[PDB]
Amino acid sequence: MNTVPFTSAPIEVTIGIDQYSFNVKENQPFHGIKDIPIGHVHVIHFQHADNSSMRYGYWFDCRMGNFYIQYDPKDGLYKMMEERDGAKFENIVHNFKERQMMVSYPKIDEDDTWYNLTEFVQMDKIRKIVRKDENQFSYVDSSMTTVQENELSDPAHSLNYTVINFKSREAIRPGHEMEDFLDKSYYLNTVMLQGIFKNSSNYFGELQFAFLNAMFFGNYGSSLQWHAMIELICSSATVPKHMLDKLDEILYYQIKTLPEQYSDILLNERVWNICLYSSFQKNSLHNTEKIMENKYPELL
Amino acid sequence: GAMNSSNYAELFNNDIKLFVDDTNVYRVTVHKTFEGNVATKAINGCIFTLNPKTGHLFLKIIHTSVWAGQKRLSQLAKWKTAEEVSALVRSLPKEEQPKQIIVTRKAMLDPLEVHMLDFPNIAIRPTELRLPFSAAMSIDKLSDVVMKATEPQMVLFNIYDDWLDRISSYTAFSRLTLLLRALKTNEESAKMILLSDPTITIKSYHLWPSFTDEQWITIESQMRDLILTEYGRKYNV
């Protein structure tokens, strides 16, 4: 189990670690998070008590280095940093654990929620969507735009999601206009899966990362990308059976985790009604359709 | 965006534009079968593609063979319309290509946008105008060429005859929409108004009768009376 120590907590802040969250008081003796499960990516996220503007946070994998958080009073945020000195890092963590100045990642043994949300998400793929190659961890916030949003403005601070545009020459073969617009199988299987993603795992990894950035940061462009990747599958007549069965699991756990009170801002009525009730795959998402009908029947 | 009464003069400026009306592309008669079920029989249709400034009409005749063994014909008809308008634009020299295509029905927007991806600078727009272009098949010479077609054909007309020698394109369009609205509302009464007097004929190379300026005023008044008379009958008003 790995540890993200904190230098201090000089400003009152709600701290997120994956799907969990904790309130820390101004100058409270808080020195970080221990017992973080090895084997998954994680996200540590922040919302300041005195300015709920900019949710922000860091995607990381404790297998890739020793990371800690330090408040920067100039830039006014909690920053993730890497410690290259292993013995210094172990000595700081040991001191904080002995003084019980750390919260424990509160995982229930029965509880596969975080695995179910991050099954296909890998740090190397996050670092290609979020470009800052000098760090092994990835900063995301509420306001960051996507490459596609910027096309329709600082490119270094952008989310490089794969551009999906149903009315683009990439999506429509000359001579197959009606076929390709009404059945997106070409666009899904040849252009996206065989061409850009190489396999369904990379496609699902990006879809899962988009959802988590939408949910944890209220990142609007991430929400658009999540819905576009759902709609591209549901709008395709020809999808491998394993991909449909896996999409149903992926979406079920996303819909299960979503805060009930955020459904109005995180769920697109048009996309979900189309995917569940009109699309080629309207009958392929049994688990997702049942949880959506029982939890958010007003959206539908 | 959408074309309405706020931007009506835009139709007669010097930016090439076309109206596309798909109403008459897929046309059927509905009839009983021997077993007492119902069946459709397609008849020849047409795309109505009009330059409202010049009167140039690109009438693409849709022959019934294009529907043979096809499904969801009302959906296909929109895509076939977009395919043929796209083909017409590509057939025109660059300086004759439209800068805007206005579709009379909003269901034509996505099919035309997708067929015109290669032309990102041609704007595809809906209109809030209710234009009577469905009544095109009430113009005897347009009906005759559509019904006689034995294969796909494009026929070029000037829907204003020689009117632009005497009137502006705004006035020519107003006269056309009034004639087509009257033909749509009461075809028999409109044709009686147009053809009753046998001393006024239609030139071989025209669509409408050779009315003098004063006779056009009389005809236009009789068309307005027809439309009001019919509105009084519909609503008992």
What does this protein look like?
The PDB classes it as splicing. The entry lists the keywords VHS like domain, splicing. The complex is a heterodimer of chains A (300) and B (237). With 300 residues, chain A is of the alpha+beta class. Chain A has 2 domains: 1-143, Substrate Binding Domain Of DNAk, Chain A, domain 1 (Sandwich); 144-300, Aar2, C-terminal domain-like (Serine Threonine Protein Phosphatase 5, Tetratricopeptide repeat, Alpha Horseshoe), CATH 1.25.40.550. Chain A is 41% helix and 17% strand. Chain A has 12 helices and 10 strands. In chain A, the strands form 3 sheets. Chain A has a 5-stranded antiparallel β-sheet, with helices on one face. A 3-stranded mixed β-sheet of chain A has the order 1-4-9, covered by helices on one side. In chain A, helix 7 packs antiparallel against helix 8, helix 8 packs parallel to helix 11 and helix 9 runs parallel beside helix 12 (286-295). The longest helix of chain A has 18 residues, at 200-217. With 237 residues, chain B is of the alpha/beta class. Chain B has 2 domains: 9-163, Nucleotidyltransferase, domain 5; 164-237, Acyl-CoA Binding Protein (Up-down Bundle). Chain B is 35% helix and 19% strand. Chain B contains 6 helices and 8 strands; from the N terminus they run βββββαβαβαβααα. Chain B has a 6-stranded mixed β-sheet with strand order 7-6-1-4-5-8, with helices on both faces. In chain B, helix 2 (109-115) links the parallel strand 6 (100-103) and strand 7. The longest helix of chain B has 22 residues, at 213-234. The chains are: A alpha+beta (300), B alpha/beta (237). Chain A binds chain B through residues 167-169, 172, 174, 177-178, 181-182, and chain B through 75-76, 79, 82-83, 110-111, 113-115, 117-118.
